[PDB]
């Protein structure tokens, strides 16, 4: 705690 | 018997779907949905958003295809950013 | 709300699984090809096909590694997670 606005294949047969 | 990492990924999909679905385009976060997302679901990592100026600045950083909204891929980049910063206090 | 959100606990879990595996061999803050493989085969065993060929883990590490040290730091691992999650998403 804390921060603020700073701002800098495959897969398969599945369910 | 799904793993913690896999559950976490799925929670990422779920929270995006919860907020993107509220208004307008059900598959994208407009400014108002993004603000609510941050204030309701990231209240321990980000300071609350109170100013339109702040919403504006955040969305602009996240919006990489220039349509004024945050799709899923742009949201993942956002989650990557946030998680990585936090990572420095772990 | 005041409870840790599902989102905030997802992020934490990402940090924990990385640190769980990055701490194993060598640099405790990076994943050598060795540690990345175990992560994938053990923690993504429902989303990604198990890796048992060395050429695969090499190529995955090649694509993940952008600062060019032959290992995956946390920033690079978040990119990996982003990609995989995106793929599972396109399941509507
Ligand atoms: Ca929407
Ligand atoms: Ca956009
Ligand atoms: Ca290591
Ligand atoms: Ca690297």
PDB file of N, CA and C in Angstrom, chain B residues 5, chain C residues 21 35-46 48-51 60 64 80:
ATOM      1  N   UNK B   5      -2.890 -21.083 -10.244  1.00  0.00           N
ATOM      2  CA  UNK B   5      -2.543 -20.223 -11.379  1.00  0.00           C
ATOM      3  C   UNK B   5      -3.691 -20.192 -12.373  1.00  0.00           C
TER       4      UNK B   5
ATOM      5  N   UNK C  21       8.455 -20.937  -8.062  1.00  0.00           N
ATOM      6  CA  UNK C  21       9.254 -21.610  -9.070  1.00  0.00           C
ATOM      7  C   UNK C  21      10.543 -20.908  -9.402  1.00  0.00           C
ATOM      8  N   UNK C  35      12.880 -24.135 -14.688  1.00  0.00           N
ATOM      9  CA  UNK C  35      11.785 -23.779 -13.807  1.00  0.00           C
ATOM     10  C   UNK C  35      10.504 -23.425 -14.553  1.00  0.00           C
ATOM     11  N   UNK C  36      10.638 -22.767 -15.692  1.00  0.00           N
ATOM     12  CA  UNK C  36       9.494 -22.444 -16.521  1.00  0.00           C
ATOM     13  C   UNK C  36       8.728 -23.710 -16.923  1.00  0.00           C
ATOM     14  N   UNK C  37       9.471 -24.727 -17.344  1.00  0.00           N
ATOM     15  CA  UNK C  37       8.914 -26.017 -17.763  1.00  0.00           C
ATOM     16  C   UNK C  37       8.065 -26.680 -16.673  1.00  0.00           C
ATOM     17  N   UNK C  38       8.602 -26.700 -15.463  1.00  0.00           N
ATOM     18  CA  UNK C  38       7.901 -27.284 -14.334  1.00  0.00           C
ATOM     19  C   UNK C  38       6.607 -26.508 -14.066  1.00  0.00           C
ATOM     20  N   UNK C  39       6.710 -25.186 -14.123  1.00  0.00           N
ATOM     21  CA  UNK C  39       5.555 -24.321 -13.929  1.00  0.00           C
ATOM     22  C   UNK C  39       4.454 -24.719 -14.905  1.00  0.00           C
ATOM     23  N   UNK C  40       4.774 -24.689 -16.195  1.00  0.00           N
ATOM     24  CA  UNK C  40       3.822 -25.073 -17.237  1.00  0.00           C
ATOM     25  C   UNK C  40       3.235 -26.470 -17.072  1.00  0.00           C
ATOM     26  N   UNK C  41       4.100 -27.442 -16.833  1.00  0.00           N
ATOM     27  CA  UNK C  41       3.636 -28.815 -16.778  1.00  0.00           C
ATOM     28  C   UNK C  41       2.822 -29.079 -15.536  1.00  0.00           C
ATOM     29  N   UNK C  42       3.142 -28.374 -14.459  1.00  0.00           N
ATOM     30  CA  UNK C  42       2.444 -28.563 -13.188  1.00  0.00           C
ATOM     31  C   UNK C  42       1.263 -27.628 -12.885  1.00  0.00           C
ATOM     32  N   UNK C  43       1.319 -26.391 -13.367  1.00  0.00           N
ATOM     33  CA  UNK C  43       0.320 -25.420 -12.966  1.00  0.00           C
ATOM     34  C   UNK C  43      -0.604 -25.039 -14.094  1.00  0.00           C
ATOM     35  N   UNK C  44      -0.227 -25.374 -15.326  1.00  0.00           N
ATOM     36  CA  UNK C  44      -1.078 -25.093 -16.479  1.00  0.00           C
ATOM     37  C   UNK C  44      -1.483 -26.363 -17.202  1.00  0.00           C
ATOM     38  N   UNK C  45      -1.609 -27.439 -16.438  1.00  0.00           N
ATOM     39  CA  UNK C  45      -1.884 -28.765 -16.988  1.00  0.00           C
ATOM     40  C   UNK C  45      -3.312 -28.958 -17.504  1.00  0.00           C
ATOM     41  N   UNK C  46      -4.138 -27.912 -17.451  1.00  0.00           N
ATOM     42  CA  UNK C  46      -5.494 -27.968 -18.003  1.00  0.00           C
ATOM     43  C   UNK C  46      -5.635 -27.025 -19.182  1.00  0.00           C
ATOM     44  N   UNK C  48      -2.645 -25.853 -21.107  1.00  0.00           N
ATOM     45  CA  UNK C  48      -1.592 -26.120 -22.080  1.00  0.00           C
ATOM     46  C   UNK C  48      -1.139 -27.567 -22.062  1.00  0.00           C
ATOM     47  N   UNK C  49      -0.830 -28.081 -23.250  1.00  0.00           N
ATOM     48  CA  UNK C  49      -0.340 -29.443 -23.368  1.00  0.00           C
ATOM     49  C   UNK C  49       1.008 -29.548 -22.684  1.00  0.00           C
ATOM     50  N   UNK C  50       1.194 -30.627 -21.931  1.00  0.00           N
ATOM     51  CA  UNK C  50       2.437 -30.878 -21.198  1.00  0.00           C
ATOM     52  C   UNK C  50       3.657 -30.792 -22.111  1.00  0.00           C
ATOM     53  N   UNK C  51       4.747 -30.246 -21.585  1.00  0.00           N
ATOM     54  CA  UNK C  51       6.002 -30.185 -22.326  1.00  0.00           C
ATOM     55  C   UNK C  51       6.935 -31.312 -21.908  1.00  0.00           C
ATOM     56  N   UNK C  60       9.668 -21.571 -26.370  1.00  0.00           N
ATOM     57  CA  UNK C  60       8.800 -20.797 -25.486  1.00  0.00           C
ATOM     58  C   UNK C  60       9.642 -19.755 -24.769  1.00  0.00           C
ATOM     59  N   UNK C  64       9.402 -15.660 -24.951  1.00  0.00           N
ATOM     60  CA  UNK C  64       9.109 -14.928 -23.712  1.00  0.00           C
ATOM     61  C   UNK C  64      10.210 -13.946 -23.351  1.00  0.00           C
ATOM     62  N   UNK C  80       3.589 -13.600 -20.545  1.00  0.00           N
ATOM     63  CA  UNK C  80       3.201 -14.976 -20.857  1.00  0.00           C
ATOM     64  C   UNK C  80       1.791 -15.301 -20.403  1.00  0.00           C
TER      65      UNK C  80
END
